[model samples]
Target chain A: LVPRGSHMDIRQMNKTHLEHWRGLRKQLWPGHPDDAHLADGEEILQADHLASFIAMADGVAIGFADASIRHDYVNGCDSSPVVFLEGIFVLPSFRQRGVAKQLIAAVQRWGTNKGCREMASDTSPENTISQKVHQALGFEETERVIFYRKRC
Target chain B: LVPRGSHMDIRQMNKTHLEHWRGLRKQLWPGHPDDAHLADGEEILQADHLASFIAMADGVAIGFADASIRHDYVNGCDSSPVVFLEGIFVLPSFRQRGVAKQLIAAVQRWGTNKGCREMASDTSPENTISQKVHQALGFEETERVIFYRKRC
Candidate 1:
């Protein structure tokens, strides 16, 4: 069952929470070989194109939600200056709780105040959990595709 | 005439490429009403959930592509870890000359090596340009929806 009373702290990454946030990122990825090398704290802090927020429980960083103001073309995104949900991650023990919801709420608020009229994100076909939760978060499935490539 | 000598390099984002990347992002957006409100370079970099690459033409940065590895859920992505193209842009002059294609190739190489069997992206239903280009790149239509929302 999903845990309750595990609240979120809607804020930016800082010195104290940097490692916690960074660590979550490392955990969010998978065992795939294409997974990128770790990005340093300095490189992360100075990137001016994103918004990051962490979900907390009694001061413990349990999850995080991050977005960016993409004035560029976002598939299925109608309005410019949309907030793209770059990614969200929570520990398995913390899933189904209101933590992700709260984190998204914060990101949506971050979008709304800054003139974003829409928020968008994606998940894998296998992770139907993300699909159900995204529906719960007021996201509508805009477009889906099966992409193919050839190695040139 | 399109420059046959315009071949360029494709690679991941780094410190030296930061400034060029930032400026192109500002250029890639549309003239929609919801923009003009929020976006910053740090937030983009800070999100830490995304992977980005640039297209260089004769040592000049001409375009860029960005994606996120989604092992969680995606509407049409068939595998556990899918690469979702957040956005890609090439200079207006570079259109139809394979720059966007190459940028995606870099993004795809990044995806393939990472064990991603699928790559996904979306755009507005009205943007026939994006729709056509995506088709040219071997993407298949999986699903489409008109997104709706409400403010709390």
Candidate 2:
């Protein structure tokens, strides 16, 4: 088991944290190749449309999050230009210690600065754990929807 | 119930169909007032980002659908620039007679012409009838999500 620390540093992504950010993103979205994740990270680094954050404890990275401004109509939302929580992950050793919570705080601050009316996130219907995490993070369940698609 | 008809003509929105389009839109999104719906219809009439189609039978409009090209990240989609089915509605008398199907076909064609590779839609978890309608319209269920929100 890893030792618990009383303080965790949360900071926005920069070149200094680029490699660690890429490593953490791969854990969350493992299907993509390393090059794609690196390119994606590089893209986010320079774009204002998205934000990424890393949570460090005792100088070691323990968690990360990604968010973006969505202009499309988001269901169960009452406003346009919503801030969307793209994804979040915490190292198993750092679980339940509020690392994810703090990471979300950084995202909230980022979105608030952008003048977003609401912050929206979603989870698969089967992922009850994620739902609880979202609720604990001050998010309310608005609606459930089954997505469908077809070739055009 | 109104008498069933063998054929329904589906046409893109034009100035002439504006009034009927507003009426059908009211049925689908009743929360908006007449002015708002009318304004929204006018916006769709002139914008390339969105498309509206009306289902007509026997010289009367019976149903309508709205779609838009969403450049934001869409869950369960493998491509960018997805065509999102904003809403679709058929009058009670015209339900289950393939009116909605024709309306979707028109939307599909519009998206196809614009180089969209996928068409996406969603329904509330409890709207089983809508789920069925989506299935009948050739849409396959991709995933279910529960939306969450927080005020920034």
Candidate 3:
């Protein structure tokens, strides 16, 4: 059993973590290279603007949460600092444990320290697990959006 | 000569406007969907979170700019009022007429009045016109993001 905070070290992610994150994303959302753009290591990382949290078991990464701070309008948010939980995932074997919850708590703590009044996260409408997790953690549903693009 | 503001008009977009937008989108980007994701009438107009601008000439809509607020993390932004210019397009006949710029300015003005301190926009790496317009409007390049997605 992965005890509370046992073998779990939540810290700011580095390039190596990003690499792992990208791999995990491919596993989570297979065959969609277009969705994994931000996960590439070529992307620049600013010290103050972005952060990630990871959970490990026996020195192997089992889960992670990617987050950032944005200055735009977050749904159900009003004039307050908002922390965006871009993506989070845990290995299938690690499900049903409190690992995901712990990761969320860590992110909320980080955001609160950063002066954020609220934290927001999103998942595809089909991601029922993520929806449940967000609701369990007190993230109210605000909006559901679909992106569209055309080459010009 | 068409007056500078002749193409600038803000109205509640309807089905006809959306159809026209989709048509122009096709011309700008061939082989692309005239209606992406099968979006419907209500979806287009009910994008209240978005400020949709249309450029009309002689009673015919020729172009459009669609923008929204993030209120989260926007590049170079530090508050909850950042504006995101998602997509902007002008018909071939409307290009180089300052319609695009004017539309952008109008959106910026709206953002400023709504307490937004920053405006953010992006384009494909290959889109020179968009890059140039953004640069001319004082929108500094902050990040170049690539999207990847796959079906589960």
Candidate 4:
């Protein structure tokens, strides 16, 4: 069983663990990470204004989640401090063992303590596992909009 | 003729002026002004990070343009400041008088001095005027991607 905590130890995410996070994102999003300049593990881990969570079992980190508090008018949110879940992933071996659920629950508790009225998340239309996980956590569909931008 | 630098005075914008600006946006892009949360006059005038240019004739503000430095990765720009044209508008009477062109040129000079190599701006697919303006200024289209989201 993975232990839950208030905060993630960034130092615990060493070189190998950081690589694992990048690998999962590559498999999940593919080709899209570079658009955000997030191809490197260091950039992903060093993003500004993110709060991270990790699930550890038997002294080994097995899963991780990251979120940020955004002040902008987020969909379905009325005010500042909307908790935005950026990414969450667990090793295949750790799946179906309730680690993901525990990590999300911990985040919710953190959000509430930080005065957030709601938490929000997003996933690509193709990532069904993410959709399922959000649904299981009682996140309702609010709005869908496509971002259009021309690169110059 | 109105003084050349009078419009650069940020103190001239007031609530009444902001209402007029919002009205101009409606004429320029129907269905857009309504969706935007109108910023208070002070907010517009107090954005220290933005450069505002205005064109005046017959002692009245006839046109306006504004741009801001943004940190997102811009094309051909690596770890350097990039400028985004946030807002620009000219009164109907000022059309074809070269006011908009002059304002944009001024903004470009400001951006260049601030170490920016490229300038970027965007408008909705329906706004043809903005498209023409960008094309006229040598900004080539790069990539278009729609944003998709599942509400939680």
What's the TM-score of chain B for every model shown?
0.81, 0.91, 0.75, 0.67
Model 3, range B14-67, lDDT digits (tens) per residue? Answer: 666776666655665576455561363345467655666667666777887777
Q: What's the alpha carbon RMSD for model 4? A: 7.3
True contacts kept of each: 0.11, 0.96, 0.06, 0.02
Best by DockQ: 2
Give per-residue CA lDDT, model 4, range B1-152, as digits (tens).
65564342222344556655555556655755454636533455676556666565645667777677655443223344666676778887667657777777777777778776666665555667777776776766543322222223
Question: Model 3's CAPRI class?
Answer: incorrect
Q: Where does the lowest 10-residue lDDT sum fall in candidate 2 chain A?
A: A1-10
**All models, DockQ values?**
0.09, 0.80, 0.07, 0.10
Question: Model 3, which residues run further than 4 Å from truth?
Answer: A1-65, A68-152, B1-16, B28-32, B35-41, B146-152
- Candidate 1 regions off by >4 Å? A1-8, A31-41, A148-152, B1-152
Q: Which digits, one per residue and each the tens of the lDDT, describe model 2 over residues B1-152?
A: 56963666899989899898888888898889999988888889898888899998877889999999998889789887999999999999879877888899999999989888999999987798998888877899999889999999
Candidate 1, residues A1-152, lDDT tens digits: the string is 46765445756765577767777877775542222413444544666556678876778888987666665445566576777776799888988878898888888888787788888776666777887888888777776544332222
Q: If you assessed candidate 1 against the hidden native complex, which CAPRI class would it receive? A: incorrect
- Local lDDT at A46 for model 2: 94
Q: For model 2, how does the per-residue alpha-carbon lDDT over A1-152 read when each residue is reduced to its tens digit?
A: 45963677999988788888888888888998999988888888898888899997777788999999898889789887899999999988778988899899899889989988999999987788899999998999999889999998
Specify the poorest-scoring 10-residue window by lDDT in model 2 chain B: B1-10
Per-prediction TM-score, please? 0.49, 0.91, 0.50, 0.55
lDDT (C-alpha, whole model) for all candidates: 0.70, 0.88, 0.63, 0.59
* Chain A only: TM-score per candidate: 0.81, 0.92, 0.77, 0.69
Quote the lDDT for B97 in model 2.
78
